[PDB]
Structure formats: C-alpha cells, structure tokens
Amino acid sequence: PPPSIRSCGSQQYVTSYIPTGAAFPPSSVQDMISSMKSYASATDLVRTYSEIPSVEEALSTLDRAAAALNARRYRDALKLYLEGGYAMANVAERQANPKICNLLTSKGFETLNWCARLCDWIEGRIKEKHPRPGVHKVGIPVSNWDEDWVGPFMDEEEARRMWYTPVYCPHPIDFSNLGYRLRCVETGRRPRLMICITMYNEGPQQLKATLKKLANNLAYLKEQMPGDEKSLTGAFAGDDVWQNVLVCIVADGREQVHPKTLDYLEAIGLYDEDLLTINSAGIGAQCHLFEHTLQLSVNGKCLLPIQTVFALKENKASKLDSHHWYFNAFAEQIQPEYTAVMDVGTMLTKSALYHLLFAFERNHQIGGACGQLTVDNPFENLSNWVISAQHFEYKISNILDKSLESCFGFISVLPGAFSAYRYEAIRGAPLDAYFQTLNIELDVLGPFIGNMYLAEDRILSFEVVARKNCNWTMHYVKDAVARTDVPHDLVGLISQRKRWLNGAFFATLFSIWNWGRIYSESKHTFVRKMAFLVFYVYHLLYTAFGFFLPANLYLALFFIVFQGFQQNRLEFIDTSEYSQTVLDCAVYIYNFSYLFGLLMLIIIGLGNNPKHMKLTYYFVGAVFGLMMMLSSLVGAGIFFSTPATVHSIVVSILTVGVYFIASALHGEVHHIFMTFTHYTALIPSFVNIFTIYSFCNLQDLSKGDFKDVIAKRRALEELRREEKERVENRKKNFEAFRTNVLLTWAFSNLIFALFVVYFASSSTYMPVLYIFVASLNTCRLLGSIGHWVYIHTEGLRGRVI
Amino acid sequence: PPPSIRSCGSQQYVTSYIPTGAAFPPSSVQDMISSMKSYASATDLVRTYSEIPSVEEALSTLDRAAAALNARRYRDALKLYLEGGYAMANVAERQANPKICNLLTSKGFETLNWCARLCDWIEGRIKEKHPRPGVHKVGIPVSNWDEDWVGPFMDEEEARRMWYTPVYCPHPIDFSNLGYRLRCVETGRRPRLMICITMYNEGPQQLKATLKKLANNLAYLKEQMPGDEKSLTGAFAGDDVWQNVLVCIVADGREQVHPKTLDYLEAIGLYDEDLLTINSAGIGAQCHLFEHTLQLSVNGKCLLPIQTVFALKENKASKLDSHHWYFNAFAEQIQPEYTAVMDVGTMLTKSALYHLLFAFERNHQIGGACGQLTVDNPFENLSNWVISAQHFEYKISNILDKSLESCFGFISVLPGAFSAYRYEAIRGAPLDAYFQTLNIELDVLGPFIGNMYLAEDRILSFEVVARKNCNWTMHYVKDAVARTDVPHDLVGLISQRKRWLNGAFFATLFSIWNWGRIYSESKHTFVRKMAFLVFYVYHLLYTAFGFFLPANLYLALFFIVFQGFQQNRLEFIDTSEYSQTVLDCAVYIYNFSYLFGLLMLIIIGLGNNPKHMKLTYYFVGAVFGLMMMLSSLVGAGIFFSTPATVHSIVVSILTVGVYFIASALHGEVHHIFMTFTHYTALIPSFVNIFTIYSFCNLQDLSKGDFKDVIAKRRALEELRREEKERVENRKKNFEAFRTNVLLTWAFSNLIFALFVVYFASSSTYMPVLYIFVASLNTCRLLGSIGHWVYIHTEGLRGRVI
Ligand SMILES: CC(=O)N[C@@H]1[C@@H](O)[C@H](O[C@@H]2O[C@H](CO)[C@@H](O[C@@H]3O[C@H](CO)[C@@H](O)[C@H](O)[C@H]3NC(C)=O)[C@H](O)[C@H]2NC(C)=O)[C@@H](CO)O[C@H]1O
Ligand SMILES: CC(=O)N[C@@H]1[C@@H](O)[C@H](O[C@@H]2O[C@H](CO)[C@@H](O[C@@H]3O[C@H](CO)[C@@H](O)[C@H](O)[C@H]3NC(C)=O)[C@H](O)[C@H]2NC(C)=O)[C@@H](CO)O[C@H]1O
Ligand SMILES: O=c1ccn([C@@H]2O[C@H](COP(=O)(O)OP(=O)(O)O)[C@@H](O)[C@H]2O)c(=O)[nH]1
Ligand SMILES: O=c1ccn([C@@H]2O[C@H](COP(=O)(O)OP(=O)(O)O)[C@@H](O)[C@H]2O)c(=O)[nH]1
Ligand SMILES: [Mn+2]
Ligand SMILES: [Mn+2]
C-alpha cells in the first residue's frame, strides 16, 4: 500500500515510510499513475526543447560514444553514434560558414557509414578484431598563401593543400598495419634523411630560427657543384635535394603548447583548430598529424620548400615517448637511411649537414655521429659570469673529452641536440633497449634501471657499439657547429645540471657494469678490443677520481693556502711573526665557514625547489667564488716567487697549461683567454652545489541487474585501492634507494677527508694528487693530439689504405 | 560537390578532399542521403535494443542529470531527469525483491514530482533561489532485530525502524534553513548532552569497545540514588537519562572506511547499502545521515538504548571538517548545553561522565574541561620499552603540567580525546576562530596561520578564555580517566610526535603573540589578571628553555661525563694515570659519534618517509639509549661517592625527586617506579629525533554555436592553468617558510653550543643549568601541590565561600 507521496519531491520536506516484504499491489500503483496529469505538460516542454539540436550537444554525444566504445560496450556505442550522426546531419544545414557546413556534412556521413559498418559487424557478417572507425584523412586549402614566392617547382595540389588525420594506434609499432599512410609515401617521393624536432612549451622565435637555419642548410647543400672530390654524390645532389629531406615536428600536448606557437603554426599553414575540433569528434585520437610542404620567406629572400609532418599528442609524456613515436612509426614506415635528432632552438650553421653526410658516406663504419655544441653570443654581454663559464666548459669538454673518446671510437654521450645515426645499426635490439622503460612497468625493472632518468642517450650509444654480430663505432665531427641557448641565471643552470648529473652518473655506472658484453658478444678487430681495454682502464680511473672530487678540492685548498699561511710556507711572505692568534684563527674561520656552507647547501637542496631560494644560493656562490679567487691569487704568488725547477715547471705545464696547448692546437684560444678567469671563480660552486643538489632530488620521477551493479562498484573500488597501494610502494622503494646512495656518497667523502687530515701532512699528500692530476691531463692531451692528427691526416692518407 | 565518400568510415583507409568556400549544393547532399538504405537496419537494431531499460543505465542517467543541474544548466537537467524517472518507473516492475521494487517505485515517483516542480519553476510560476529536489527521508525496518532484549520502554516505530536521508547543504550553517530535521527533534525529545565520535579507517573492535563503555557510563549515571549531596539533579536523573544523550558518529568517506566496520554497522542496524545506492541517485549528496535508537547486548547482559546519528561524508576531509559539520549543523539545530568530543577507541571508565557533569554543574565558571589520559594495559608486556616510556610521559605530563595550568585556570591544550565544553561560551566568536581555515583560502591567511596544522584545539582553548565581555576559565578533572591505545613501534610514535610537536610549537607561538587580548578585551577579576601575568612569565621562561634543549643536553652529558673522565674529576676513580691517548680518545669518539648520528638523523628525516628506514632509526635509538644509560650510571656513581652537602642534596631533590614527590602525593607512585628506568633510556632519542623530524616535514599540508564552443574551451584551459600556477606558488611559499624556520633553529643551537664549549668551563656553566632546572621543577611542584590542596579542600570549604 503506497502512502500519500503524491507531493514528496515538490514540497521542501516530506516524511514517508516504505514497508518491505509487502511488494505493493500493482492496481494501486497504476491508479496512482493514472491520477497524475501534470507530467504531460513537462513532456510537451521536452518535446519542444529537443526539436532543435546544437553543435556542442552533438560533440558531447560523440565523445560519450567514443568513450563507451573504448570501454568494450557496443550497443550503447551504436545508439550514441547513430544519435550523434543524425544530430550532426540535421545541424549541418543551419551553419553559415561554408567550411563549417562542409566539414559537418562530411563528419555526419562518415559517422553514419561507421554506424552501418558496426551494425553489420554486430550481426557477425564481417569478421574483424577490435573494430574501429575507418581512417579518413581530409585535405583543405590553406587560409594564407604567398602569391609572390618563386620556388623550383610546386604542383598546385601539393602547394595549396594541407592534409590532416587523427590516429588511434595505441602501440606505435602497429602504425602501418592499421592502414595509416603519409603524403610523402602516397606521392611517390622516398625521403632518405629524417629530422625530428621535439617541442614543448616554446616560443615562436626559437622554432622560426630553427626552420630558417634548416632552410639555409638545404640551400647550401643544393648550391654545391659536382665533379669535386669533396662533393657528395647520389640523392643529395643539387636542384633535387629538397625532396629527400623530411622534418617531423613532434609536439607534447595541447594543454602546454604556448598559444603564440599555435598562432605561428596557423600562420604558415600547419594547424587549423576548427578542422581538429570537428574531424576528431568520435575517433578518440591519441595524436593528430598534419602534413604539408611548407614554404618560408624571410625579409626579401625566399627559402626552399620543406616537407613537414607535425604530430600533436593529445596527452603529455616525456621526450622519450616522442622519440618512441617518431622512431617506431615513421622510421618503420618510410625506412630511411640516416636519422637526425635535435631539440627546438638548436640553430645550426651553413656547413653542418654537409659535413655530417660527408663523414657518414666516406667512412662507412660510423654507427652514429655528433656535432660540436656552442653557446650563442658568448662575447656579447661579457659582464655576466654564468654564460662565460658555461661557454668555457662547453669548449673544454668538447675538445678534450670528445677528441679522446673519438680516438677510441666510443663517445660516452652524444648531445641530445644535433645527433645523428644510420638507420641500419639501431633498427633491432638497440632501439628495444632504448625504449625498455616505456614497455615495462618500473616495478619489474627495479630501482637501478628506473633511476636512469634522462640518460637513455648513453644507453643507445653503448648499444650501438656493443651490438652482436656487428662492428659499429661512434665518431665525432669537429665542424658540425650547433649554437644553443643557455640559462642566464644560477637557478636554471642548477636545475639543468641536476638532470644532467643524475643521468650521467647512473648511465656511467651501467656502462661500467655491462662493458663485458663488447668482448663477449661483439665481433670487433683484436686491435679494437685492446684499444677498448685501454679506454676502459682510463674510464675506471677517471670515474674513481671524480667520485672523490669534493674532498680532494677541500684538501688541496686547505693544505696549500692555510697550512702555508699558518706553518710559514708561503714563499712571498714570512709568517713566523704574529701573536699565534691569527695563525689558528684563519684555519678555524675557513673550517667553520666551509662546514656551515655545506650544511646550508645540503639542507636547502634536499628541502625545497631551488627557485625561491635565489638569495641563499647567490650568497653561497659568492662566498665560494671569493674563496677560490683568493686561493688562486695565493697559488699564483707562490708559483711566481719560487725560483722554479724542472719538476715544478713540468707539473705546472701538465696541470694547467694543457688547456691552453689544446686550444692553441685547435685554434680556439681566444675564448679560453676570455673565459678562464670567469670559469675559475665557479669551480667549488659547480662541484659542491651541482653534485649535492643532483643527488638530493633523485626522487623526482614519472543491461544488468542490481547485484551486478553492486559487484561492479565493489570490484572497481578494490582495484583502485590496490593500484594506489602499488604506486605508494614503488615510490617508497625509489626514495629508499636514493637516500641510501646519498648517505653512502656523503659519508665516504667525509671519512676520507677526516682520515687524510688527521693521518697525513702536506709533504706526504700533495705529490700523490699532483701525480694523479698530471697523469689524467697528460692522457687527455695525448688523446686530443691524436684526434687532431687523424682529422688532418686521414683525408690525405686514405689513398694508401 | 561532395566526393565519393559513400564508403569512407567502412574501409580501413580512405582519402578525400573537402574544398572550402563552395558550400556544396543541397540537392546533391539530399540525393546522397536518399541513396543510402542500410542505415534503417541499424536504426531497427537500436529500436530493438532501447525497448528494455536497465537499473545501471537509469542510475547513470540520474547521475548525469544531477551533475548537469549542479552545472547551472536546467533544460538538459530537465530532460535527463524525466528520462531517468520514466526509466526507473518502467524498471520497478521487473524486480523480484519487494524492498528493491518499493524503493525503485518511490524514487521514480519522487523524481517525477521533482520534474513537475522544476518545469513549473522554469515557467516562472514559482519564485525560488537555487531550486533543488525536495528532502525525502525514508524509514525502513531493520534486517536483524533482537527478540530477547528487555529495555526501559521502546515504542515499536522507534525500536524497529531506522531512518535515512541524504543532505545537500554546501555550507553546514544552513543545515536548518534548507528544511532538514532529525528524528530526535521530531519526536519531541530534547537532548542536553551531545557526544561526537570521529572515525576514519578503524576496525570494528575499537568502535564496539567505545560503544560498550558509553553504555556502561549511561547505566552508571542511571543507577545513582537521589537525595545525596554528591548526586546530580535535573535532566540527568535515573530511569530517564538515556533520552538526554545523543551520539553523533561522523565518518570520513566511503572510499577509506574499513569494510568490516561497514559490516558491523549493518549488523547493529545503522547502514544499508541498497537504500543508500537507490535513494541518493540524483540528489548529489555531500553527506548521508542515518538515525536510529540502537540497543546493544554483550554476552548475557543487555545495555541501555543509545540515540545515534551516523553521518557519512561522500568525500574525504580533515577532522576539522568533521568537527565543522558536527558543531555547526547539529549544535545549531538541537542547541544543547554541554558538548563532548572524543576520538574512536577512547575507552572510558564507569565514573567519567558523572565527574565531568558534576564539575560543570557545581563550578558554573568552567568554560571547558578535559580528563586524564592513560595507556591501556601498561603493566602487561613489560618487555616492550616504548609503551612504558609513553605511559611514564603521559603520567608525568598530566600530573605536573595539567595541575599547574589548572591552578591558574588556563589549560594549554585539552586532549583531542575526551574533552568537553559548555555550549554557551563557544557559540559565537570562538567557533568562528576555530574554523578560520575552512572558510578562507590559505593564500589569504598566510604561512603562519596555515602552518598551524593539527593545532586548532589550542586555538579554541585560548579563544574560550579570552572571549570579550565574558570570564570563562578552563579546568582539569582528575578522575575522568580515559584509556587510549598507543603505537607499539618506533615509527608510529615518530609520526604521531611529528604531528603533535608541529602543532604544539606553532600554537604556542600564536598564544604568546596574542596573549595581550586577555588584558585588552576580556573582563576578568584583577587577581585573575595578576595570576595570568605570573603564568605568562612562567610560560615564556619554559618555552625559551625548551627551544634550546638539544644544546643543553649535549653540553650536560659532554661536560659531566667526559670532562670528568678526561680531567680527572670522577670521584670514584682516579684518571691521572693512562698514556694521554685514552683521555682525548674518549672525547673525540663521543664528539664524532654524536655529530655523525645527528647528520644521519637530519638527512633521513628531511629525505623520506620514516617507515622503510626502520633499521637506521632503531640503530640510532639504540646508540643514544646506550649513551644515556652510561651517563646515568656515571652520574649515580658520582653522586653516591660524594660525601654529600646541603647544596648537593637540595639540588638533587629539586632536580630529580620532584617526580617521586608528586607521584606519591597523588598516589601514582608504582607506575613511576616501574617506568622511570625505561623512560631514562629514550630522552636523547625523544628530543633529537622527534624535534628534528617534526621540523623537517613541516611542508606536509592539505544550445550554442561553434564560436561559443571554442571560447568555452579556451576559457576553461586558461582558468585551469591559472589555478595550477596559484597552487604551485602557495606550495613554494610554505616550503620556503619551513626551510627558513628549520635553518634558524639548527644554526641557533649550533652557535650556542660552540660558544659555550669554546668560551666556558665546567665550573662556570653547570651552576647556571642547575639553577634553571631547579627553578622550573620547583615551580611545577608548587603548582601540583596547590592543585591537590584545591581539589581536596574546595569541596569542604565551599560552604564558607
Ligand atoms: C657528469 C660528467 O661526468 N661529465 C659531464 C657531462 O655529462 C656533460 O655532458 C653533457 O651530457 C648531457 C647528457 O645528455 C647532455 O645533455 C643533453 O644536452 C642536450 C643539449 O644541451 C639536450 O638537448 C639534451 O636534452 C640533454 N640530454 C638530456 C636532458 O637527457 C649534454 O649535452 C652534454 N654536454 C655536452 C657539451 O655534450 C658535460 C657538459 O658540461 O659536463 C661534463 O662535466
Ligand atoms: C610540545 C610541548 O611543549 N609539550 C608536549 C605536549 O604537546 C603533549 O601534549 C599533547 O598535545 C597534543 C596536542 O593536541 C595532544 O594531541 C591530541 O591527542 C589526542 C589523544 O591522544 C588525540 O585524540 C588528538 O587527535 C591529538 N590532537 C591532534 C592530533 O591535533 C595530546 O593528547 C597531548 N598529550 C596529553 C597527555 O595531553 C605532551 C604529550 O606527551 O607532551 C609534551 O611534551
Ligand atoms: O616534458 C618535456 C620537457 C621538455 N621536452 C624537450 O626536451 C628538451 C629539454 O631540454 P632542456 O630544457 O634540458 O635544455 P634546453 O636545450 O631546452 O635549453 C627540449 O627539447 C624540450 O622541448 C620534452 O619533449 N618534454
Ligand atoms: O583523515 C583523517 C585521519 C584521522 N582522523 C581521526 O583523527 C584521529 C587521529 O588520531 P591519531 O591517529 O593521531 O591517534 P590515535 O588516537 O588515533 O591513536 C582519530 O580519531 C581519527 O579517526 C580523521 O578524522 N581523519
Ligand atoms: Mn633549449
Ligand atoms: Mn587512536
């Protein structure tokens, strides 16, 4: 017996009782239903409201249909798809803009055809697996086109039409099996060189500069004459080079792309928002790819056409995911010969690609090459210290380390900007090892592999060399000069060095651990194996010395400066005078200041982000710079007051003058003279701050029934709770590992420093440090000299062998 | 002219071109539409599929309708509500269970009535603001009822029916204006005492124990005889007390409530999942409240009925939000006299509520009272050290600090478990200051107020005392013994102490800062103001001494033990012998071990969660315990070998024996004898570990068109980005503040310790420390004696004044 609940939701508050077990009489319920008439009025209103549909409602219905289809439910998907198709077909007539009307009509027809196909599939007439809407790319004219632009030759269809398609491929390896194709493959052009330009949250200026530089490089490649020994022959000839180069611009997400970048892309005819919004309504795209052959004009000069594929991912993911998409999908489809990788903003020079291709074609044994990296505008604004210090560091590191590692044909790390590979030695196992993280959950991999974040470049570099049944060796080219941009403040430098140091240390540990695979599996010449053994010994020694760097720096400064001041060993002044208070006060002040600075640095670095702590980092850097400048002045005075000796001059040469010798040999001597003073004032800051902060933030890393409803809710809740627990456990493990590593490092350094201070004197420790430093710098100088000899000789002596 | 796109979504890959500006001819489009016939087949399938609706689909449609209604869109809300109502009305007939059928029929009728009301409102016939579905509470019989249970008297309707209603109130202050009511108010009973039992992720055993203890307390209150001077008179008499007590059980979220707790609640008839799922389909409830008068039986004895309101919040929020809901909604509606707050698991004793009510009624000036807190089963399992140490700390803290602060009538912090207030001094401004965080975004409040997390109890305690135009003083009752449960391991203790120490320190700073309001605004007696001044001076001195505790502990241990060993000042052994190596080796070992331990502790505490670092914390605690035990043994030997003096014995008494004197005065002497040895072995661990880890993790804290669509998307993205930036900025500010505070604390301690070590000797520093400690302990002992005198005298001397 139903109570008086005729007005229960209408009134503000209503109380009722619902007995259980009576089940009610149906006649009373029907009488209650028939006694209410107002409902019809509401019904009429709804029937009046639903007559005219709306674009937004149709898009929402299509989105719901796509979500349901991705959820393994088809009947609701079919109903929603039919409703959306009919709604869009009705709506298309009302719109006034011809573009919008045409796009809506095409989308409606496509949706109706997909509905028919799915209905046929449900009946079992068509046998497929995981049915999806058919691929339907759309070509539209460009809004803005330059009437006055003279190029080699451009078909009207290629020149004035930009193509678009959304993709659904969840595993990019299947990008070609699902039936997707590009304009280049369809047209018959077969590019040989592919360049990937990753982009995420970047202003239009950097992209414009990169595209202009690429066009200039292509023009220079075109303009070279034939018949010369240094001229490339083959598909890279003149007047036809622009058809053999393809540029993939892989963005990282609509949510983070700078709006001005989107405006610039729309200006050059590569991104139209209306087409993206309309065509991708119900597909549920992982990415959207636009294709064009863009033409760029700067000032009064016209550049060469560039074939461009712009891929925009719906979600956000790391750069490794962008490389995954690029390499797997596009490389597997087009199958090029040389694959080049660079970041946005890397402004090349005229003669970079020519040198790279020349080296690749002539040598035939190079499994990967990298160019020299330099800072844009080093001389300009010489007042700033950080830019000059970074310029000096880039020059010295490039010359010495790259030369030495290229002599043995094993580059430790190719720069993430402007690197190149040949797509024959990285197709199989090396790429699989490159993308090991993206295919396996980090719980299975463990902490060691997981912590190798922003370091996979070294993984690929090692895998190319140690590939089984092959002998691929990396190489370094001097002339491939690429100009980047560096942070102008301390905080950005700190963050960048954090990433670089973490990746470098863990990749180096992995390489040292797995070096044996070269002898076990690879097929190299015996001389190559011996050279690799020598380089392995050198690498072990250098890593061991670099792991104990802060203690060595502290000991050197302390001993030399202060125990020459206190124990009267400075040669330009006698300190046997004074009241014995200053002599100990200097040492106490130095020790207390150093310890307090280190404590403050470690607390701040482990604690919070280094962006709001600008003043403290500036203060610590200034203190350390003053200390290092004072120590350098005292050392210079000591050296210039000593009557000099053969041992002394040999040590001084092999310790300090190796930089000047190498720079004069390679002709880059003026930069060193300009920037050595600036670099000398940041060495302790570099070592301490960067290493400590890198090791501190290592944690940072990526038609049922009621019973069915209840069971579904319980299962979903249980699964969510289990997933949350697993994520928490993984984070706990990574934090524990990073804490253990940091404790080991800090305590090893402290114990070593204390033992050396308490159980050794200056006359018994400094010779060992001098010998170690002299040995390392002598090895590096020999490597640089060997590389220069090779680069200036092998061209002429290639005729002999 | 439309291209051949008849088969575009059907095929795997289709290429087409869509010109812009032509707008297409409608005749060709219509001819293309009329040339396709297969669509009808699909249509038929949909018409066949949509005939039979489903419960889950109806619930999903209602949920979408509620979401749309909350989104200020009414037409779509009206359509979805009508569709869901019709679907549920059709579905209700098919179900077999009478309960499900009745609930579905009632929900369908309610939905249809709400649809009619909303349709009338849209036409403007009814004038309202923010229309919402009408409140409709449902009473259902309990599944399990005890046939054999003899109580005082129970109406059939009250005994055998449980009531339920979902609420929508976004601002709980409006809980009574929206028209919601409780069973107690409707029935005519007017409770006077309200008890809130917060719950979040707790096992059934704790809740069962708490309910059993509450029933025992009510029975003891009932059984007391009248006509006695110590017997309460009024609404708390016998045979009718159970009607004047209401218990609010406020959960914290369905996602985190332990399933066994839900099963237990369903067992005693307070939670039915089917009713919750069905009735709350379209309201969009912030909380769901069930009401019952539950009867509990344990073993062969039957307890007294308890009026219970169980409120379950849909989302998760802090305990402060639960108190907000409880206080505002229920206190404003019922308007009780005394409000009691306790946590789940607080097992009371028989004579707790009686003592609390007796004190409140007799004194008439107490604006809030708190009971003594103790550990359950202290003697059992005496092998464990942590439980005994916590028991000793609870006893000593309670006795001394509570007695001294109750003498001046200002308790620093009432325990979060088993506290009480009178609902006349907290109704206005004090509650507004209590809930300042929940009504104002933390950006406006700033870092200082925001960092006062888990400390609002002290805020309320201070606001009650310093209320304008009133004189309310807090009070402490000795006999209100409540037994809690304490963590058995070091890690849980560490986390709990982290929370407590953070809250305590920042609340203490706030109180010291704003103490002037008592003199400025409050209306107290002059003698009260003088007493508050004396207590303020004592509080300042104690806080100042406690801020420099680690340095004082280190100095005391170092000086006494090691500089008695090295400089031959231990009185039971002469160290003028030995080869001068041990004498300095002891000091060096002590200093190095202490510094390394502190460094490890601070790095670990700042670094990661203290749950996977169990071994390191155990090791550090063991080292510090061994050190403290050795120091205690050496000190005892020194004291017992000295020929003794009046000054020495006075210092020893006023330093150590104050604990024993106070415990013997209050009769709790056996616990101190049992647990003093265990507590002595954790003092350095307590101080260092708890303070450092508390200060390390301070960061932890809580029908449009296409152009309209594009503008909507852009606006939503911009708003989301702005919100993300604001959240990041707030987190940056809080991290910076906590880092600055930690640096200040650590560097102050280190500088003080170094200065005292280098510029002072044992004979020039220890007397000051002895004087300070003796003064503080003498003041505390005098406070305890005064409190005991008051508690044993005022009862007899109340006749005089
Ligand atoms: C730590 C050590 O032993 N030696 C230092 C070198 O590690 C360091 O070389 C730099 O290595 C990193 C590793 O990748 C390179 O980072 C890449 O940089 C490019 C261009 O700047 C960027 O596009 C990439 O994203 C980035 N890779 C990432 C983030 O994974 C960096 O280019 C190397 N620098 C050079 C000149 O090659 C050098 C650099 O100062 O210092 C040694 O001390
Ligand atoms: C740090 C200092 O100067 N003195 C210490 C006191 O702060 C501490 O007293 C404790 O204060 C906290 C503050 O609230 C109380 O925490 C509450 O505890 C109850 C029951 O355990 C719990 O229900 C509450 O949730 C919790 N409040 C929160 C989390 O905000 C604690 O009860 C107080 N302890 C006592 C016995 O009253 C004492 C305790 O050892 O130590 C002083 O050194
Ligand atoms: O989430 C991200 C962040 C960055 N990047 C790219 O990775 C590189 C980051 O380089 P970094 O900022 O270290 O140095 P930069 O060369 O940009 O100054 C750039 O090419 C970015 O576009 C990316 O693909 N995804
Ligand atoms: O998100 C939360 C976490 C805890 N609590 C309650 O707050 C108190 C936390 O007490 P704590 O864990 O510090 O000590 P306990 O007394 O529980 O051992 C308990 O009453 C919990 O039920 C809560 O309401 N919400
Ligand atoms: Mn860059
Ligand atoms: Mn508890």
Author numbering:
A (entry chain B), B (entry chain A): 40 to 741, 762 to 860
Paper lines:
The core of the chitin biosynthetic machinery is an integral membrane enzyme named chitin synthase (CHS) (EC 2.4.1.16). Here we report five cryo-electron microscopy structures of a chitin synthase from the devastating soybean root rot pathogenic oomycete Phytophthora sojae (PsChs1). They represent the apo, GlcNAc-bound, nascent chitin oligomer-bound, UDP-bound (post-synthesis) and chitin synthase inhibitor nikkomycin Z-bound states of the enzyme, providing detailed views into the multiple steps of chitin biosynthesis and its competitive inhibition. The structures reveal the chitin synthesis reaction chamber that has the substrate-binding site, the catalytic centre and the entrance to the polymer-translocating channel that allows the product polymer to be discharged.
The structure of dimeric PsChs1 bound with a pre-translocating (GlcNAc)3 and a UDP in each PsChs1 protomer was obtained. This reflects the post-glycosyl transfer state during chitin biosynthesis. (GlcNAc)3 is trapped within the chitin-translocating channel through a series of interactions, including hydrogen bonds and hydrophobic interactions. The second GlcNAc moiety resides at the entrance of the channel, sandwiched between Pro454 and Trp539. The newly added GlcNAc moiety extends outside the channel, representing a pre-translocation state. As in the substrate-bound PsChs1, the uridine moiety of UDP is fixed in the uridine-binding tub. Unlike the apo structure, however, an approximately 7 Å retraction of the VLPGA loop (452–458) and an approximately 100° flip of the side chain of Pro454 are observed in the UDP/(GlcNAc)3-bound structure. As a result, the entrance of the chitin-translocating channel is opened. In the UDP/(GlcNAc)3-bound structure, the Mn2+ ion forms coordinate bonds with the β-phosphate group of the leaving group UDP with a bond length of 2.2–2.3 Å, which is consistent with the range of coordinate bonds between a first transition metal and a nitrogen-containing or oxygen-containing compound. Our PsChs1 structures revealed that the entrance to this channel is blocked by the swinging loop, specifically residue Pro454, in the apo and substrate-bound states, but it is open in the (GlcNAc)3-bound state.
